[PDB]
Design a protein around this ligand. Structure first.
Ligand code: PMP
Ligand code: PMP
Lengths: 396, 396
């Protein structure tokens, strides 16, 4: 039965990691990953997380299954983060949240829910997006189409091209928006642009799907949710897939949420029953440890304060590295202006390096970026900045 | 878009739990769950698990993502449990294991892998099976057909009817077997019956899919895997979905494995690349905490010994409750022989109670079984046995 199965293709991001591990040279610089790294180049467990895990070790008396939708406090804390305390969506009980195995799991649950229970056939994603979006939606039987996003000429949002692209989307199509810290470009809509998109989406009959992988990494928790909240003010229905992997440093514990919003409480509860059915037929119920850590932190004043400061420290270190990168390239004699990097948000930027320049950076200099030119700014440190920028200047 | 979604149906097992929670009467007895309970009626965290979690708290320095297939040591320990240390399958590198979110997650991964990469259209399951089998396979686009299993007349395996049922299965169909502790009946094939089935499956061209939810709860770790190993001796290809929920008391941490076996190392690696693709498009990579606990225990002589004794204690307590149940029914004056209960294995038995007798038990006596008559033997204690058996005698 398995004799003639074709091997799955290499995969751009995970394949690069395989190459970095096989490479035994000494001065190597990894900008090709999707995790935060601190000034020492490590991805530590957050202190707030360790404190929460100690509390769980001391206090948990059972591992009995969670509900299909997971820990209730986790859902409540998630909705407050997304929509704001005192949001009409929360007051009117228009939103239901399922705890999921990561943001990826949330996207998969959303896709299965939509494929099985609605007329949705098509999801629009930005060009470029995280390559896993296509894989997730396709696995549910949904077609993926691209909308213009990235202005490759000046590394900004091509807003006119975006609008014109999305004219082809029909009423009842889903449109995926990265809520902040776009992956891979780090280019986000301004608030006014979000507001323009919110109005257009209502007019055109799109179902918005927001993906929040990095809430807190652009400007702050509340600011980063502005775009979502502009949509939420205008729409009867939307879905949010959110992740706590980066902002809690909980990658491998698989901590995410799928939040369903409908016009009223009766409708959302009915629809959510089918979202729960989609989860039941997938992994039954979600993993407790990471989500319990998040709920424990978010619901405790002391822990939440420690965590919010840790998140602020990550956001600020990335901002420092953006500035340092631009400054250092200038003083090492780079032949183009890199100031666009300062305007980009979160973990990722498109460097504007060509695929051949990135190949040369890996082969000649041991500097690892994704083939698209995506760099993880959190992979930069004061200690590796000079060699990194020297290598980049050399390939320009 | 969500206006006319139909609510998902009630669900027999989870719905009963909802009824038990709403019921505020005092002497209630819950036999309707799928978790182990000790003599105090609680589902404790195992001591070996607490010790392992303390070690992780003290020693983990990152939560960076696991590989798509999870922790390597977890995979190795899993294959040894299933196939035996020194199995030819392991020596010949014919097996690859992905860590998954629970046994349910493993079944889903298997189903998605098969739907996308093989000619499989149809999965055969026992009548009765765990109702989630149908939901999982159907969600992947696979048809489910039933084979005869339970002899409702004398509460034994109807082996002739089973064989005759499976004559309708075509070459290339999947046949699901519960490896031990059948859910819901607790009726397992003898070794000779397993051997007969293994031979028939080779002859007929079935792909065996084993589901192991309760390894160690029938007779012991090695004994409970005998049936699987009889199949593994005969087949080029099979899949195993296994769970550590019950045998490690790790239900909510979602700890399972999907193990793919093919004719040789080249073939299994190629096929497994597509199993990894199926995981990537679902939840990306698996939750680390519970699987790390299992790997930590299984790979440490001291912890493994503590755990194996805890598992032995659970297995033995269930056996004591089976005997006590039969004895107590006899002395309370039951009008039928219940000796079949002693021959059944693991958490579950079919009581032979009718749907109306179970309704009456809930409404009049506050005794909760599943509508099919499934009881969780681990829900029985020395303290609740007399009232339980008095209620049963009353409805006969
Ligand atoms: C755009 C985007 N969406 C979703 C995710 C999901 O991450 P996870 O499944 O680890 O939560 C990520 C993180 N790679 C991302 O960058
Ligand atoms: C037959 C069977 N298969 C699979 C499972 C999967 O359990 P889990 O997903 O919690 O590992 C169970 C436990 N209800 C079961 O009884």
């Amino acid at each position: 039965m398995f004799e003639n199965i074709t091997a799955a293709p290499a995969d751009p991001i995970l394949g690069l990691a395989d190459l970095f591990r096989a490479d035994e040279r000494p001065g190597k610089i990894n900008l090709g990953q999707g995790v935060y790294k601190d000034e020492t180049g490590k991805t530590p467990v957050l202190t707030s997380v360790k404190k929460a895990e100690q509390y769980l070790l001391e206090n948990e008396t059972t591992k009995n299954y969670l509900g299909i939708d997971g820990i209730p406090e986790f859902g409540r804390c998630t909705q407050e983060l997304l929509f704001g305390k005192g949001s009409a969506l929360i007051n009117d009980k228009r939103a239901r949240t399922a705890q999921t195995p990561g943001g990826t799991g949330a996207l998969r649950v959303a896709a299965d829910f939509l494929a099985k229970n609605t007329s949705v056939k098509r999801v629009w994603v930005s060009n470029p997006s995280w390559p896993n979006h296509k894989s997730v939606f396709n696995s549910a039987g949904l077609e993926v189409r691209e909308y213009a996003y990235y202005d490759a000429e000046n590394h900004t949002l091509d807003f006119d091209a975006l609008i014109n692209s999305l004219n082809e989307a029909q009423a009842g199509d889903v449109v995926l928006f990265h809520g902040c810290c776009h992956n891979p470009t780090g280019i986000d809509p301004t608030l006014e642009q979000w507001q323009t998109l919110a109005q257009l989406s209502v007019e055109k009959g799109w179902l918005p799907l927001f993906d929040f992988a990095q809430q807190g990494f652009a400007r702050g928790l509340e600011e980063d949710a502005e775009g979502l909240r502009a949509f939420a003010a205008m729409h009867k229905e939307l879905i949010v897939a959110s992740s706590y992997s980066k902002n809690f440093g909980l990658y491998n514990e698989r901590v995410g949420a799928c939040t369903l919003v409908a016009a009223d409480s009766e409708t959302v509860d009915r629809a959510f029953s089918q979202m729960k059915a989609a989860i039941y037929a997938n992994y039954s119920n979600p993993p407790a440890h990471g989500a319990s850590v998040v709920a424990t932190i978010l619901s405790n004043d002391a822990l939440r304060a420690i965590w919010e400061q840790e998140l602020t420290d990550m956001r600020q270190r990335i901002q420092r590295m953006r500035q340092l990168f631009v400054n250092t390239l200038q003083e090492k004699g780079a032949n183009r202006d890199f100031s666009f990097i300062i305007k980009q948000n979160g973990m990722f930027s498109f460097s504007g390096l060509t695929k051949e320049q990135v190949l040369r950076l890996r082969e000649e200099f041991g500097v690892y970026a994704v083939a698209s030119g995506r760099v993880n700014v959190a992979g930069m440190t004061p200690d590796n900045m000079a060699p990194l920028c020297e290598a980049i200047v050399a390939v320009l």
